[PDB]
Amino acid sequence: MREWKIIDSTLREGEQFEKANFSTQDKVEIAKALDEFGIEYIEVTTPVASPQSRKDAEVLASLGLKAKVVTHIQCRLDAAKVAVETGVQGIDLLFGTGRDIPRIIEEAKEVIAYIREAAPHVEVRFSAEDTFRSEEQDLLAVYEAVAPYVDRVGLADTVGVATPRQVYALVREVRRVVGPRVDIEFHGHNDTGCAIANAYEAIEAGATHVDTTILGIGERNGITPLGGFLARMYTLQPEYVRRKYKLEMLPELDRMVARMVGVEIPFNNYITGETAFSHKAGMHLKAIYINPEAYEPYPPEVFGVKRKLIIA
Amino acid sequence: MREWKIIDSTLREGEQFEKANFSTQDKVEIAKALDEFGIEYIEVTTPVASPQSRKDAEVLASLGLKAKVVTHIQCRLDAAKVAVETGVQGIDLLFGTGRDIPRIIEEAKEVIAYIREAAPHVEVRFSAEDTFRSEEQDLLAVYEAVAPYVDRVGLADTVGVATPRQVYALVREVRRVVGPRVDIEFHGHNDTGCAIANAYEAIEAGATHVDTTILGIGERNGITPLGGFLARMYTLQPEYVRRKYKLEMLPELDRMVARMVGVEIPFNNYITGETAFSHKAGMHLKAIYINPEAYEPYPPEVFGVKRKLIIA
Ligand SMILES: O=C(O)CCC(=O)C(=O)O
Ligand SMILES: O=C(O)CCC(=O)C(=O)O
Ligand SMILES: [Cu+2]
Ligand SMILES: [Cu+2]
Known about the structure:
Two copies of one chain form a homodimer.
Chain A: E1 5-11, H1 24-37, E2 41-44, H2 51-61, E3 68-74, H3 77-85, E4 90-95, H4 101-118, E5 123-128, H5 136-146, E6 152-157, H6 164-178, E7 183-188, H7 195-204, E8 209-212, H8 226-236, H9 238-244, H10 250-261, E9 278-279, H11 282-290, E10 308-309
Parallel strand pairs in A: 1-2, 1-8, 2-3, 3-4, 4-5, 5-6, 6-7, 7-8, 9-10
Helix pairs in contact in A: 1-2, 1-10, 3-4, 4-5, 5-6, 6-7, 7-8, 8-9
The complex binds 2-oxoglutaric acid (AKG) (2 copies) and copper (II) ion (2 copies).
The site of one 2-oxoglutaric acid has 11 residues of chain A, from strand 4 and strand 6.
């Protein structure tokens, strides 16, 4: 342990997906299914975006889910006011990208102090945008000063270019300065194919929370996908992962979102793709007959799917 | 540098894709386009598989490509004989997965010695299957003893479960025992979402050759995809990558293979997916107007595609 939780962002980052147009009912359906699956947090679009985004946050936060519903806002006093009024259980602050550090620290602590005052039970996370490309002394100076006032700090690979040893190194340094009590969240884009690998390295370095979306939908090619992330963690912590989540629901989660946003599940999609458990080579087929574990990273039945043998 | 080459395996690993059924002409088309693109090696199915696979290897090796054509066989004398007779420029040996090490070394060196004798100009690579899960002392003992007799050794994450720091560590240890002259190849499956990240870590650790396939097609959910790998390497070595390959051909490569194997390019596919350069968030759109580099990991025009702004 290696203890960690997932923050699903399908109703925040996922809304930024090109073809996403979630009705209030779509969002409630998604949130209930995630809650059934056992997701620990559900993050939703800032209530400042539109009157409908506000309403959606208000409903989602009041559904009586076991998952904590949290909203994502700019690190500003005016947004924070709207946020607390929605009744969310958490607020995820993003400090957006030659300006002095004490001031940045002062600005952040002001917003955070407002929240503690207006709603002492709401969990507060603070992230700086584009965390891995920020100059590191100043980044750590800000995180060190803000951490005693927040429940969680986050790191965001905003443009999807962080590398895995880079993520590992910077998460370790953050954990050093913020200490053991403060949680650590990782959000990573998939532009260079490293979202799942980077989330895994973040956890190895001490991160406690990983952002995912169903099918990885999000801005551009999106972020760490739920299924791919669970495949990665299952092979390392099968007992933990199987206990935490209803893994056999993964195909229904992926189908639901694919249907709503108007895409096909990629042919090679982790676990649920057409091809994820297809075997063809003679020597592979030979071994799978004695033991399918021979060429399978995890059992298809765990995730509610089946293998295919191409003996043709 | 950070010098490296790509071994495309679309005509070997890619043939193991569930829906692959390449005619001889499909393979020639693919090989010529890869050669135009500037791929350094093209790996093809063992000639032992069928009379048609033999013929295909014979044709491909004789196309007069600038790329070296190499075939992939079991580490056996009988296969090696068929292999040399095809005229390929390289042979990629795979030693397939409580049996003693001197014997394994003897068996391998016998096959390798046959090749040197029968065809001294053919490049020989040796890999042990499932390299990252093999007990490491014995694995290094075999690689150390075989390396002086081969041009290249390879490591294969056969079941797609290696982790990035694991790949980095084992490539470094292999480089230690084989020395600087012997090349090092990485082949990684994508079952846990780490194929691109693991190939990148392999190169950082000293690997010189990475196996890819177009769209990552292959057994199960396949291997490191060409486009995703190039996106990852471009952000780190833009000058090198742009000089090495005709990057604007990537959409045609992905389209060609998707058409042949009967799949759609995934909606979120690296670079060439419907969604790879779609922007939606207001603050993102705001910044992209001043500078698209603000939320883009690489320029779409480099790879012959265009961005999308969802201002709606
Ligand atoms: O608040 C965060 O950590 C993530 C914000 C975001 O979507 C990004 O920077 O990519
Ligand atoms: O020869 C190799 O390195 C790769 C063989 C293969 O496809 C695998 O082990 O996954
Ligand atoms: Cu994001
Ligand atoms: Cu393979």
